[PDB]
Every structure is written in structure tokens, then in C-alpha cells.
Amino acid sequence: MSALLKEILALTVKSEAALWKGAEQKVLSGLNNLAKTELVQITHHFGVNKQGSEALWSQLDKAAVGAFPELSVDETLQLIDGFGECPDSYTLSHDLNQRLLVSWEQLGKLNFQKLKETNPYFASDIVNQLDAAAAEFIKVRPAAESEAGGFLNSLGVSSSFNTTKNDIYVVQSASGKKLNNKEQREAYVLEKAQKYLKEDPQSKILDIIAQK
Amino acid sequence: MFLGIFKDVIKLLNKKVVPVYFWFFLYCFLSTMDTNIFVSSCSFLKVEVFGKDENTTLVLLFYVFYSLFNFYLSRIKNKNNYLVRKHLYTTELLIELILFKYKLIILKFSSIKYILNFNVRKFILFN
Amino acid sequence: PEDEGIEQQLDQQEVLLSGRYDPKLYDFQEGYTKNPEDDQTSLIEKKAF
Amino acid sequence: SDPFKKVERDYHNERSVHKHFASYPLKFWWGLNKFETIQGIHSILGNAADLVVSTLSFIPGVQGRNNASYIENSIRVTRFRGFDDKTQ
Amino acid sequence: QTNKEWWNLAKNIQDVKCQQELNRYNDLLSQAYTLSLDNTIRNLVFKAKFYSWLFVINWFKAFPDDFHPFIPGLEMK
Amino acid sequence: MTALFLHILWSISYIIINILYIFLSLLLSNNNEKIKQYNSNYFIKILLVLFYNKNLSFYKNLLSEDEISKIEFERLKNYPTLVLIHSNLNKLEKRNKIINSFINFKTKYRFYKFISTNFNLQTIIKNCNDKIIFSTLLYIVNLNYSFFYKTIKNTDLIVYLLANKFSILNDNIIVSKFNISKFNDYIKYINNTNSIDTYLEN
Amino acid sequence: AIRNFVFKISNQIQNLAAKRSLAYLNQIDSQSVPSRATINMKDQVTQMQREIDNMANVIRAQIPDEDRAEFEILKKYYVTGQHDSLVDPQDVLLQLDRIQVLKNLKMIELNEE
Amino acid sequence: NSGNALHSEYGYLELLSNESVQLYKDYYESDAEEDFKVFENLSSKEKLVMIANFENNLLPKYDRSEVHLIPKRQWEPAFGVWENFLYDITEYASFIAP
Numbered sequence: 001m002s003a004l005l006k007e008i009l010a011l012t013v014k015s016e017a018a019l020w021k022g023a024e025q026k027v028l029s030g031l032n033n034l035a036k037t038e039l040v041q042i043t044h045h046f047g048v049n050k051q052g053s054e055a056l057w058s059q060l061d062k063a064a065v066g067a068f069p070e071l072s073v074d075e076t077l078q079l080i081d082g083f084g085e086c087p088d089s090y091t092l093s094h095d096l097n098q099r100l101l102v103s104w105e106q107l108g109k110l111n112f113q114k115l116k117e118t119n120p121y122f123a124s125d126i127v128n129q130l131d132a133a134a135a136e137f138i139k140v141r142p143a144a145e146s147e148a149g150g151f152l153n154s155l156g157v158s159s160s161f162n163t164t165k166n167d168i169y170v171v172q173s174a175s176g177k178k179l180n181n182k183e184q185r186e187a188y189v190l191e192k193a194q195k196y197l198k199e200d201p202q203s204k205i206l207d208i209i210a211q212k
Numbered sequence: 213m214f215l216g217i218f219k220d221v222i223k224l225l226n227k228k229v230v231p232v233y234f235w236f237f238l239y240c241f242l243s244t245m246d247t248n249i250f251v252s253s254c255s256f257l258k259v260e261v262f263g264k265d266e267n268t269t270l271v272l273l274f275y276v277f278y279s280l281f282n283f284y285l286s287r288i289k290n291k292n293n294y295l296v297r298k299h300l301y302t303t304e305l306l307i308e309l310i311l312f313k314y315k316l317i318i319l320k321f322s323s324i325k326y327i328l329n330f331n332v333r334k335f336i337l338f339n
Numbered sequence: 340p341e342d343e344g345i346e347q348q349l350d351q352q353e354v355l356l357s358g359r360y361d362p363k364l365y366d367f368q369e370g371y372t373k374n375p376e377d378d379q380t381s382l383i384e385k386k387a388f
Numbered sequence: 389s390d391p392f393k394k395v396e397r398d399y400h401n402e403r404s405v406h407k408h409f410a411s412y413p414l415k416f417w418w419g420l421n422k423f424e425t426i427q428g429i430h431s432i433l434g435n436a437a438d439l440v441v442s443t444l445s446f447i448p449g450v451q452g453r454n455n456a457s458y459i460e461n462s463i464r465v466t467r468f469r470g471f472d473d474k475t476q
Numbered sequence: 477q478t479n480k481e482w483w484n485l486a487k488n489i490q491d492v493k494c495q496q497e498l499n500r501y502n503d504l505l506s507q508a509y510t511l512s513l514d515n516t517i518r519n520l521v522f523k524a525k526f527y528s529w530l531f532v533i534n535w536f537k538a539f540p541d542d543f544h545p546f547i548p549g550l551e552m553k
Numbered sequence: 554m555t556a557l558f559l560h561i562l563w564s565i566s567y568i569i570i571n572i573l574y575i576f577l578s579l580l581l582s583n584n585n586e587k588i589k590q591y592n593s594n595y596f597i598k599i600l601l602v603l604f605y606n607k608n609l610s611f612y613k614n615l616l617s618e619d620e621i622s623k624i625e626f627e628r629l630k631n632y633p634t635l636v637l638i639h640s641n642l643n644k645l646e647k648r649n650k651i652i653n654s655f656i657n658f659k660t661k662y663r664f665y666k667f668i669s670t671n672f673n674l675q676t677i678i679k680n681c682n683d684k685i686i687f688s689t690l691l692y693i694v695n696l697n698y699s700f701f702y703k704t705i706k707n708t709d710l711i712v713y714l715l716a717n718k719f720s721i722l723n724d725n726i727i728v729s730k731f732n733i734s735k736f737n738d739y740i741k742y743i744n745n746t747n748s749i750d751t752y753l754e755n
Numbered sequence: 756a757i758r759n760f761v762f763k764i765s766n767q768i769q770n771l772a773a774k775r776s777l778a779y780l781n782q783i784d785s786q787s788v789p790s791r792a793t794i795n796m797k798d799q800v801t802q803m804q805r806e807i808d809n810m811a812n813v814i815r816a817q818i819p820d821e822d823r824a825e826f827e828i829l830k831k832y833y834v835t836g837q838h839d840s841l842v843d844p845q846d847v848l849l850q851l852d853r854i855q856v857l858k859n860l861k862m863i864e865l866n867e868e
Numbered sequence: 869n870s871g872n873a874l875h876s877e878y879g880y881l882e883l884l885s886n887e888s889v890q891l892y893k894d895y896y897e898s899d900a901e902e903d904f905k906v907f908e909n910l911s912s913k914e915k916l917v918m919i920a921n922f923e924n925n926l927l928p929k930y931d932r933s934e935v936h937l938i939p940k941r942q943w944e945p946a947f948g949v950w951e952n953f954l955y956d957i958t959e960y961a962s963f964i965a966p
């Protein structure tokens with residue numbers, strides 16, 4: 001158990017073809033013997049080191065799906081990271097991606113709820129920061145609508161939350177460092193847009209920036 | 213364009229802008245108790261509910277039933293989910309209560325004369 | 340040109356430099372008081388004056 | 389129902405207790421008519437309601453107020469005349 | 477020449493460097509005149525006389541809010 | 554009830570204007586092409602800003618996308634009560650189009666890696682896992698800026714917001730939003746804004 | 756004639772409005788009366804804002820430490836969260852209830868100790 | 869667009885008060901009977917008094933009054949009283965007024 005995990009760690013660090021083959025066979029045979037924690041750790045280690053046979057990953061996908069309900073937050077994060085940095089030829093069956101997608105969204109929603117309750121200004125602070133340098137059309141967006149039902153939704157009329165959006169954003173650095181000028185900000189935005197375009201040629205970030 | 217105006221009139225009278233409750237209130241306001249269909253036939257409402265100068269017993273029973281039902285619904289709703297935007301009217305009431313609680317604190321620890329002078333100065337600046 | 344702005348500056352110097360308004364010649368007082376009392380204005384106001 | 393019994397006069401009924409304790413906390417808001425501001429608010433609402441009735445009077449069975457009639461003007465105008473909360 | 481109540485109010489009031497700004501707190505600083513007394517009949521009579529006389533004497537003073545010689549301010553702070 | 558009172562009076566004004574609009578159209582040249590030439594007039598723009606909504610037939614096909622956007626922008630900027638009336642009228646749309654995103658785990662993680670590499674999520678949220686912060690930020694964007702998904706790709710919008718936010722400074726910043734048209738905001742705004750800080754670039 | 760006269764009225768009105776709105780920037784008016792009026796308005800505004808803060812400070816000092824946390828929440832909301840739509844008052848209410856839960860627990864302990 | 873001042877218009881005013889105090893110190897530099905410590909921590913009224921005597925010596929000393937030409941729209945007899953009147957109104961609100 002502990003020795004086998006250390007052996008996998010050492011072999012992965014060495015990054016030798018024969019060692020990877022030996023580790024792949026050993027883990028594949030001992031998947032049932034190893035517990036959920038060991039399976040998650042080895043899956044994470046393989047992903048970060050970028051090695052593993054397609055059959056091994058396919059069987060790991062089956063194991064993760066079967067044992068998914070008994071996973072903690074740390075276990076879920078490690079599996080997400082490992083399956084994120086997985087070999088390219090690892091087209092997964094349409095059960096694990098759904099589980100990872102659902103789990104990741106739930107973690108974000110729960111984190112948002114916990115942060116908002118602890119500090120009601122958490123959501124407001126983020127939105128102001130995002131909208132500080134945003135374009136005018138971005139600020140023109142409508143407001144949130146009340147989805148609650150009842151008399152106001154069935155027999156009454158509920159006034160909308162939209163109000164005038166002519167506001168001035170004053171940005172001040174908490175640390176006190178000098179802020180970037182308009183030219184510097186434009187260069188920063190342009191550089192990021194170019195990087196995103198290279199990763200995704202179909203991105204329309206150029207048009208979005210050009211709009212305003 | 214006559215069709216366009218007619219469609220606009222229908223939309224302006226839509227439920228989302230003119231509540232059906234307003235129409236029901238308007239119908240009750242315009243019609244008498246003998247012409248109102250909702251109550252002319254029903255003798256209980258026309259006599260036992262709205263016909264008694266003092267109906268404390270029935271009023272109390274109705275309020276108790278309504279209170280328990282709404283307490284149950286609110287408890288169920290809070291238990292199930294809470295990350296749902298609430299209506300503006302309910303939000304404003306909660307805002308006013310929180311402001312009122314703070315205002316009581318200020319009044320408790322501050323003099324009436326100081327309050328009056330501060331408010332007068334603030335009003336003068338606003339003008 | 341006899342510019343309005345420049346001429347106003349020049350006449351101000353002419354009036355003040357005429358010597359008729361020398362502070363040495365005047366004993367500044369409140370005036371409105373029943374009894375003769377010196378200027379009661381604040382120290383900053385005197386310097387501004 | 390039987391409204392006739394209520395109409396019937398009775399020594400005990402007339403001198404009995406008509407208003408009970410529960411009604412006092414529920415009906416004490418009627419004393420706000422003392423204030424001129426409250427009287428102004430109610431008059432404005434009444435005038436606004438009359439205007440709505442007049443505009444919608446075209447439908448059969450609904451007749452709005454006529455300014456010619458003296459009774460309608462007198463009652464609408466003298467409702468709060470001489471109001472005194474001290475005298476029962 | 478002040479009391480603990482005024483000092484407590486004065487220290488809490490912070491970031492004020494102008495007498496005109498402090499005069500805006502004159503009513504708040506007036507709370508230092510606690511004049512604590514019981515409401516016995518003799519005291520109740522004295523209170524009525526003392527405050528009525530205090531109103532009359534202030535009328536003869538006729539000082540404005542700007543000049544408050546008996547309300548300690550910035551200099552003592 | 555105040556909103557209903559404003560809506561009814563606005564509705565009565567809207568009906569009267571349209572009746573006048575029809576009467577003028579029938580009396581004058583009665584050509585839509587001629588009418589469209591005056592959409593840039595000073596007063597015509599005010600009339601549109603006053604009585605134009607996407608859910609009504611008034612100037613249904615006589616305005617272009619650019620003109621409509623400008624009219625909406627002007628109303629949303631310097632007309633509080635009109636925005637209240639028109640915002641309520643917008644409820645009649647009942648669009649209620651909710652669309653999910655990041656269906657494929659592969660794409661979602663790749664987008665997360667790019668954001669993590671090019672940006673420091675610790676600034677937005679402190680003492681939290683990067684993946685959790687990434688998921689939280691996506692939820693925030695969906696709640697707030699989902700209006701643009703009809704035309705703007707979600708990934709592009711998220712990158713644009715992140716790039717602009719970090720352009721100001723690659724560190725924690727404090728943002729204050731004020732509406733100088735309002736008395737309370739203006740007094741806070743002038744009080745909080747100092748010339749020395751602006752000169753020092755703080 | 757008529758058109759020129761109308762413009763002359765407009766020219767004087769526009770000059771009057773421009774002076775009435777931006778005379779505090781220049782020194783055209785001797786003694787800088789509009790400039791001192793503008794400075795006075797800002798001083799009154801800043802003092803009023805500072806006076807509100809000072810009033811909170813003195814109450815904060817006198818408030819019992821048990822409910823000092825509640826005072827901080829109420830003070831912060833009254834200054835910031837009141838005018839912000841993104842700040843849900845329910846969360847502020849929830850914080851108050853959590854404080855009330857602790858007070859209720861302490862109350863019940865004292866009664867039934 | 870408004871009679872109120874913006875944030876960028878207050879830093880300039882603050883400099884004027886500081887400049888006025890400095891101008892007084894420079895001119896009366898060679899005066900024994902002058903204590904400049906009094907100018908430290910001025911009151912709001914005291915600052916206003918100093919601002920009253922502030923003077924900017926880099927401004928041009930000539931009168932800035934001048935004449936500006938705004939071309940008119942000649943009356944068009946082909947339109948009529950109302951059409952020309954509306955043309956004048958929109959022109960005034962659109963070009964002449966701004």
C-alpha cells in the first residue's frame with residue numbers, strides 16, 4: 001500500500017517508459033485492492049506527469065464512476081485536476097464528464113452561498129470590480145429579476161429592479177501602488193486578447209474590445 | 213396601424229402590468245353587492261362575513277389559519293432553497309426595518325436637539 | 340489699445356500709489372460702535388486686508 | 389340572517405354592549421381623521437376614485453357624479469366639517 | 477475646566493481640526509451638562525425654576541452658536 | 554401602486570401620441586421612407602426616448618439597430634422614472650431563456666487553465682482553492698452578465714471582464730460606485746475623491 | 756431684427772448661465788465670491804459626512820460589547836448596503852439572527868442554570 | 869451641465885488656497901514683524917479669507933471679451949411659417965444653443 005504508492009511516486013518522477021509500463025500494469029491489477037483515496041492519488045499523479053495507457057484510463061473512469069458518491073471535496077478536486085491534465089486520447093464516456101461537471105458547479109454554488117452569507121458585500125464587491133473598467137454597453141445590462149412566486153407574481157405586479165445606470169466608478173488600490181494609465185490598460189487588454197485568440201482562433205474578443 | 217394600436221392596448225392591459233387583482237378590485241368597486249356575481253349569490257359572504265358589524269370570532273379564525281399556513285410555507289421554502297431573488301416590496305420592507313433599528317440606536321444615544329439640528333442642516337444642503 | 344483689463348490694473352496702481360490711502364495715515368476703527376474702538380477683525384483677516 | 393330580528397327593538401338589546409374589547413385595537417385608526425393631512429389624503433383618494441368612475445361610466449349600469457347636483461357636492465365637501473374627536 | 481462626560485465625547489469625536497467644524501457638535505457636547513438630580517418634590521420645583529431662569533438668562537446673553545464661551549471646545553480638546 | 558399609476562398615465566399618453574401619429578401620417582405625405590429621414594432630429598429623438606419600447610408597434614420598423622440601442626442607452630442614463638416605466642413594460646417579453654454552458658469537461662478545464670495561467674484568482678477571492686474560485690466566478694457571471702449570451706459568447710465575455718479588471722492593477726483594488734445625479738452619492742463621491750491620490754496615481 | 760433680438764436675449768442668458776455654473780473656476784469676480792461659495796459647500800458636505808462618522812464612533816464607544824457586533828453590522832449597512840441593490844438584506848438579517856441565537860442561548864442558560 | 873463642481877475641479881481650488889498663503893509669505897519674506905506659523909491649521913473661514921485675495925499672475929492681462937460668429941439659417945419662403953418656425957427651433961436646440 002504505502003510502499004506501492006511511494007514506488008509509483010518514484011517511477012513517475014523518473015519518467016521512464018518501462019517504469020510507466022510497470023506502474024500501469026501494477027495499478028491496473030490492484031485497482032480493486034486499492035481504496036478510493038489511493039485511486040484518486042494515483043490518478044492525480046498520472047495526470048500531472050502526463051502518462052498512462054488508454055485502457056488504464058478507461059478502467060479508472062469506470063472505477064471513479066462507481067465510487068463517485070463516496071468522494072470528498074479534496075478527492076473531487078484531485079480527480080478534476082487529474083482528468084483535466086489527462087492524455088489527449090482519453091475521450092471519456094458520457095457519465096464521468098456529467099459527474100465532474102455537476103460536482104464542479106455544485107462546489108461553486110455552495111462556495112458562493114457560504115461567502116455571501118459570511119459577507120453580504122462579497123457579490124457586490126466582485127461585480128463593481130468587474131464593471132469598473134467595463135464598457136458602457138456592459139453596464140447597460142438589465143438588473144436581476146425576482147423569480148419568487150406568490151400573490152405578486154400571480155395576482156399582483158412586482159416592479160422591476162432596473163434603475164438608472166449612469167454611475168461613476170472610483171478605483172483605489174488597497175496596497176497603494178500606482179495604477180495603470182489608459183494606454184497601459186489598453187495594452188494589457190490587447191495582449192490578453194491576442195493570447196486568447198491564439199488559443200481559440202474563433203474568439204471574437206477583438207470585436208468586443210473594438211465595440212468600446 | 214389600427215391593428216398595431218389595438219395590439220399595444222392589449223399589451224398595456226396585460227397581466228404583467230395591470231394585475232388581475234386590480235381588475236377584481238375595480239369590478240367590486242364599480243358594482244353593488246346585489247349585482248356583484250362573486251357575492252350576490254353567496255349568502256354567507258354577503259351576511260356572515262361582510263354583513264356583521266363585528267365578526268371578531270370569524271376574523272380571528274381566518275387569521276390563525278392564514279398565519280399557520282404562511283408560517284408553514286415560509287419554513288418549507290427556507291428549508292428547501294434560499295438563493296432566490298425576492299420581490300421588491302418584501303425587500304424594501306426588510307430594508308426599512310434594518311434602517312429603523314439603526315435609527316432607534318441613534319436616537320437612544322443622541323439628543324433630540326442634536327438630531328433636529330443635524331437633519332435641518334442636511335435638508336438645507338439638499339436644497 | 341487702451342484694453343479694459345490692462346487699464347483697470349493700471350488705474351488700480353494709480354489710485355493705491357497716489358498716497359491718499361496710505362495705511363499709516365488712518366486709524367482704523369469699527370465706527371458703528373458708540374465708543375471709538377480699534378479694528379476687531381481676526382488676525383487672518385487683518386493680514387488679508 | 390333574519391334581519392327582522394335585528395330591526396326589532398328591545399330594551400335589553402339597545403342598552404347591551406355593542407362594541408367589545410377586541411374591536412378597539414382594530415378600529416382605533418378611525419381617529420386619524422382628526423389630522424388635516426389625513427383628511428387631505430382621503431379627499432384626494434375620493435376625488436381620484438370619482439374621476440375613474442366618471443371615465444368608466446360609459447359602460448351600462450355605472451353612472452359617475454354630476455357636479456350640478458347639490459347633494460353630491462355637499463356630502464363630499466362637508467364630510468370632515470366640524471370634526472371633533474373629543475365629543476362622542 | 478471640563479468633566480469626564482465631555483472628555484469621553486471629545487475623544488470619540490476625531491479628525492476635526494476646525495472650530496467651525498467642532499461647533500457643529502455643540503449640541504452633542506451640550507450633553508455634558510448632565511445636571512443629575514432626583515425628581516423629589518423640592519428638586520422638581522428647583523428644576524422648574526432653574527431651567528426657566530436658565531432660559532431667561534440665555535435670552536439676555538443672546539450669544540450666537542458661533543460664540544459659546546461655556547461649551548468647551550477645540551482648545552481644551 | 555405608484556408604478557401602476559405611472560404606467561396608466563404613460564399608457565394614456567402613449568395612445569394619444571399614436572393617434573396623433575396616425576392622423577399626421579394620413580394627412581401628410583404618408584410615406585415611411587420620408588418619416589425615417591427625421592429619426593436623427595433633436596425632438597424626434599426625445600419622443601422616441603419618451604415613448605419607444607421594443608414590445609410596442611410605435612416605430613416598429615422605422616429604426617435601425619444602432620438607433621434603437623442609442624435610444625435605450627439615453628433613457629437608461631438620464632431618465633429614472635421612464636426607465637421604471639419601460640423596465641416594467643419589458644416584463645411583457647417573458648423571454649425567460651435560460652441556457653447552460655461548458656457542457657464538455659475537456660473544454661471547461663482547458664478554459665480554466667488558461668484563466669489560471671493568465672490571471673491570479675487569489676486577488677478576486679482570498680483563501681480559497683483556485684478551482685473553487687473559478688467555479689464561483691462563473692456563477693457570478695451567469696447571474697449578472699448572462700444578458701449578453703444572446704449575442705456574446707460566454708467564454709469571450711468572461712475573458713474580457715477579467716482582462717479589464719486586471720488592467721487597472723495586478724493586485725487587490727477597491728471600487729466605489731456613485732451616481733452624482735443623486736445627492737447622497739455626490740456628497741460621498743466628492744468626499745472620497747482626493748486630488749492628491751489622483752495625482753499620485755493611487 | 757426680431758431674429759437678432761431673440762438671439763441677443765439668448766446670448767445674455769447663456770452667458771448668465773455659464774457664469775452662474777462655472778464662475779468658481781476663474782478669478783473674474785473680485786474676492787472670488789463663487790469660489791468661496793463652492794469651497795463652503797464642500798466643507799459643509801465633508802463635515803456632515805464626518806459628523807455622521809463621529810456620531811457612530813461615540814455610540815460605538817458607549818455601546819455594550821455584547822451587542823457591539825450588531826451595531827457594526829447596522830452601521831455598515833446604513834452607510835453602504837442601503838443604497839446597493841446587489842447587497843441582499845436577507846444576509847444581514849441572517850447575521851442578526853445568528854447573534855440573536857447566541858443571546859437566546861445565554862438567556863436560557865441564566866434562567867435554567 | 870450643472871452648477872455643482874466635480875472632483876477634478878476641487879484639487880485646483882485647494883491649490884489656490886495654498887498658493888494664496890505662499891504668495892503672502894513670499895511678498896512679506898523680509899518682514900521681521902511677521903509670524904508664518906499662524907497660517908498652519910487654518911479654519912474654514914480663514915481659508916476662505918485667503919482665497920479671496922488669491923491672484924494668478926500667469927493669466928493673460930488683457931480683456932478676454934471677444935465676438936464669435938454663428939451662421940444663421942435664412943428664412944425659406946418655400947416652406948411656410950410653421951415649417952420654418954420648426955426648422956429654427958430644432959436648429960436652435962441642436963446647433964445654436966450648444
Ligand SMILES: CCCCCCCCCCCCCCCCCC(=O)OC[C@H](COP(=O)([O-])OCC(O)COP(=O)([O-])OC[C@@H](COC(=O)CCCCCCCCCCCCCCCCC)OC(=O)CCCCCCCCCCCCCCCCC)OC(=O)CCCCCCCCCCCCCCCCC
Nearest residue numbers: 304305308324328417420421422423424425426427428429
Ligand atoms: C416607509 C414607511 C412604510 C410604513 C409601513 C407600515 C405602515 C403602517 C400604518 C401606519 C399608518 C399611519 C397613519 C398616520 C400617520 C400620519 C399622522 C398625521 O397626519 O400626523 C401629522 C400631523 C398633521 O398635522 P395636522 O393636525 O394635520 O396639522 C393641522 C394644520 O396645521 C392646521 O393648522 P391651523 O392653521 O389650523 O393651526 C395651526 C397653525 C400654526 O399656528 C401655530 O403657531 C399654532 C400654535 C399652537 C400652540 C403652540 C404652543 C407651543 C408651546 C408648547 C406647548 C403648549 C401647550 C399647549 C399645546 C396645544 C397643542 C398645540 O398651522 C398652520 O397654519 C401652519 C402652516 C401649515 C404648514 C406647515 C406645516 C408645519 C408642521 C405642522 C405643525 C406646525 C406647528 C408650528 C408651531 C408654531 C411655531 C412658530 O402633524 C403633526 O402632528 C404636527 C407636526 C409634527 C410635530 C411633531 C412634534 C414632536 C415633539 C416636539 C417637541 C419639541 C418642540 C415642542 C415645541 C414646539 C416647537 C417650538
Ligand SMILES: CCCCCCCCCCCCCCCCCC(=O)OC[C@H](COP(=O)([O-])OCC(O)COP(=O)([O-])OC[C@@H](COC(=O)CCCCCCCCCCCCCCCCC)OC(=O)CCCCCCCCCCCCCCCCC)OC(=O)CCCCCCCCCCCCCCCCC
Nearest residue numbers: 510511512513514515516517518519520521522523524525
Ligand atoms: C389614586 C389617586 C389618583 C389621583 C391623585 C394623584 C396624586 C396627586 C397629584 C400629584 C401631582 C404632582 C406629583 C406629585 C408626586 C411627585 C413624586 C415624585 O416626583 O417622586 C419622585 C420619585 C423619585 O424619582 P427619581 O428621583 O427620578 O428616581 C427614582 C428611581 O426609582 C430611584 O429610586 P430608588 O431605586 O432609589 O428607589 C426609591 C424609590 C422607590 O419608589 C418606588 O418605585 C417604590 C414603589 C413602592 C410602591 C408604590 C406605591 C406606594 C406609594 C403611593 C403614593 C402615595 C399615595 C397616593 C394616593 C393618594 C390618594 C389616596 O422611592 C423614592 O425615590 C421616593 C418615592 C416617593 C415619591 C412618590 C410618593 C408620592 C406619590 C403620590 C403623590 C403625592 C401626593 C399625594 C397626596 C395625598 C396623600 C398624601 O419618583 C417616583 O417614584 C415617581 C414614580 C411615578 C409617580 C406617579 C404618581 C404617583 C402614583 C402613586 C400611586 C397611585 C395609584 C395609581 C393610580 C394613579 C392614577 C392614574
Ligand SMILES: CCCCCCCCCCCCCCCCCC(=O)OC[C@H](COP(=O)([O-])OCC(O)COP(=O)([O-])OC[C@@H](COC(=O)CCCCCCCCCCCCCCCCC)OC(=O)CCCCCCCCCCCCCCCCC)OC(=O)CCCCCCCCCCCCCCCCC
Nearest residue numbers: 506509527528530531534537539540541543544545546547
Ligand atoms: C418640549 C417639552 C417641554 C420642555 C421640556 C424640557 C426642555 C427640553 C428641551 C431642552 C433641554 C435642554 C435643557 C438645557 C440644558 C443645559 C444647556 C446648556 O448647557 O446651556 C448652557 C448655556 C451654554 O451656552 P453658551 O456657552 O452660552 O453658548 C451659547 C450658544 O448660543 C449655545 O446656546 P444653547 O443652544 O446651548 O442654549 C442653551 C439653551 C438650550 O435650550 C434652548 O434653547 C431652549 C429649548 C426649549 C424651548 C424652545 C422655545 C422656543 C420658542 C420659539 C418657538 C415658538 C414658541 C411659541 C410659544 C407660544 C405660547 C407661549 O438652554 C436653555 O435655555 C434651556 C432652557 C430649558 C427650559 C425650557 C422652557 C423655558 C420656558 C420659559 C417660558 C418663558 C419665560 C417665563 C414666562 C414669561 C411670560 C409670563 O449657558 C450656560 O452655560 C449658562 C451658564 C450660567 C452663567 C450665565 C451668565 C450670563 C451672563 C454673562 C454673559 C457673558 C459671559 C462672560 C463673557 C464671555 C466669556 C468670557
Ligand SMILES: CCCCCCCCCCCCCCCCCC(=O)OC[C@H](COP(=O)([O-])OCC(O)COP(=O)([O-])OC[C@@H](COC(=O)CCCCCCCCCCCCCCCCC)OC(=O)CCCCCCCCCCCCCCCCC)OC(=O)CCCCCCCCCCCCCCCCC
Nearest residue numbers: 156158159234237300301433436437440554555556557558
Ligand atoms: C390616485 C388614483 C386612485 C384611483 C382609484 C381607482 C379605483 C381602483 C384603484 C386601484 C388600486 C387599488 C386596488 C389594487 C391594488 C393592487 C396592489 C398590488 O398588488 O400591487 C403590488 C405592489 C407591488 O409593489 P412594487 O410595484 O414592487 O413597488 C414597491 C413599493 O415599495 C411599493 O409602493 P409603491 O412606491 O409602488 O407605491 C405604493 C405605495 C403608495 O403609493 C401611492 O401613493 C399610490 C398612489 C396612487 C396609485 C394609483 C394606482 C391605481 C390607479 C387606478 C385608476 C386608473 C384610471 C385610468 C382611467 C383614466 C383616469 C383619468 O404604497 C405603499 O407601500 C404604502 C404603504 C404605507 C401606507 C401609506 C398610507 C398611510 C400613510 C402612512 C405614513 C407613515 C409615515 C411614518 C409614520 C408617521 C407618524 C406620524 O405592492 C404594493 O405596492 C403594496 C402596497 C401596500 C399598501 C397599499 C395600501 C396603503 C395605501 C396606498 C396608497 C394610497 C392608495 C390606496 C388606494 C386608493 C384608491 C382610490
Ligand SMILES: CCCCCCCCCCCCCCCCCC(=O)OC[C@H](COP(=O)([O-])OCC(O)COP(=O)([O-])OC[C@@H](COC(=O)CCCCCCCCCCCCCCCCC)OC(=O)CCCCCCCCCCCCCCCCC)OC(=O)CCCCCCCCCCCCCCCCC
Nearest residue numbers: 572573576577580581582946947948949950951952953954
Ligand atoms: C381666454 C381663453 C382662455 C385661455 C387663455 C388664452 C389663450 C390664447 C392662446 C393664443 C394662441 C395663439 C396662436 C397663434 C399662432 C400663429 C401661427 C402662425 O404663425 O400663423 C401663420 C400660420 C400660417 O400657416 P403656415 O405655417 O404657412 O402653414 C400653412 C401651409 O399652407 C400648410 O403647411 P403644411 O401642409 O406643409 O403643414 C402644416 C399643415 C399640416 O397639417 C397638420 O399638421 C394639421 C394638424 C391639425 C390638428 C390635428 C389634431 C386634431 C385633434 C384636435 C386638436 C387637439 C389638440 C392637439 C393638437 C396637436 C398638434 C396639431 O398644418 C396646417 O395647416 C397648420 C395650421 C393648422 C390649423 C388648423 C388647426 C387649428 C386648431 C388646432 C387645435 C387648437 C386647440 C383645440 C383644443 C380643444 C378644443 C375643443 O397660420 C396658420 O395657418 C394657422 C394659424 C392658427 C391660429 C390659431 C389661433 C387660435 C386662437 C384661439 C386659441 C384657443 C383655442 C381653443 C382652446 C381654448 C382653451 C382655453
Ligand SMILES: CCCCCCCCCCCCCCCCCC(=O)OC[C@H](COP(=O)([O-])OCC[N+](C)(C)C)OC(=O)CCCCCCCCCCCCCCCCC
Nearest residue numbers: 506507509510511512513515519520523524525526527528
Ligand atoms: C391637556 C393636557 C395639556 C398638558 C400641557 C402641560 C404643559 C406644561 C408646560 C410646563 C412648562 C414648564 C417650563 C419650566 C421648566 C420645567 C422643567 C424642565 O425644564 O423640564 C426638564 C426637567 C429636567 O429633567 P432632566 O434633568 O432629566 O433633563 C434631561 C436633560 N438633561 C440631560 C440636559 C438634563 O425635567 C423634569 O424635571 C421632569 C419634567 C416632567 C414633569 C412632569 C410632571 C407632571 C406633569 C403633569 C401634566 C402637566 C401639568 C398639569 C396641566 C393641567 C392642564 C389643565
Ligand SMILES: CCCCCCCCCCCCCCCC(=O)OC[C@H](COP(=O)(O)O)OC(=O)CCCCCCCCCCCCCCC
Nearest residue numbers: 261262264265266267268270271272273274275411414415
Ligand atoms: C374560516 C375562514 C372564514 C372566512 C374565509 C374568507 C374570508 C375573506 C375575507 C377576510 C375577512 C374580512 C372581514 C371583513 C368584515 C369585518 O372584519 O367586520 C368587522 C369589522 C367591521 O368594521 P366596521 O364596523 O368599521 O365596518 O372589521 C374591522 O373592524 C376590521 C377588521 C379587518 C377586516 C378586513 C380583513 C383584514 C385582514 C385580516 C387579518 C389581519 C388581522 C385581523 C384581526 C385579528
Ligand SMILES: [K+]
Nearest residue numbers: 776870871872
Ligand atoms: K459646474
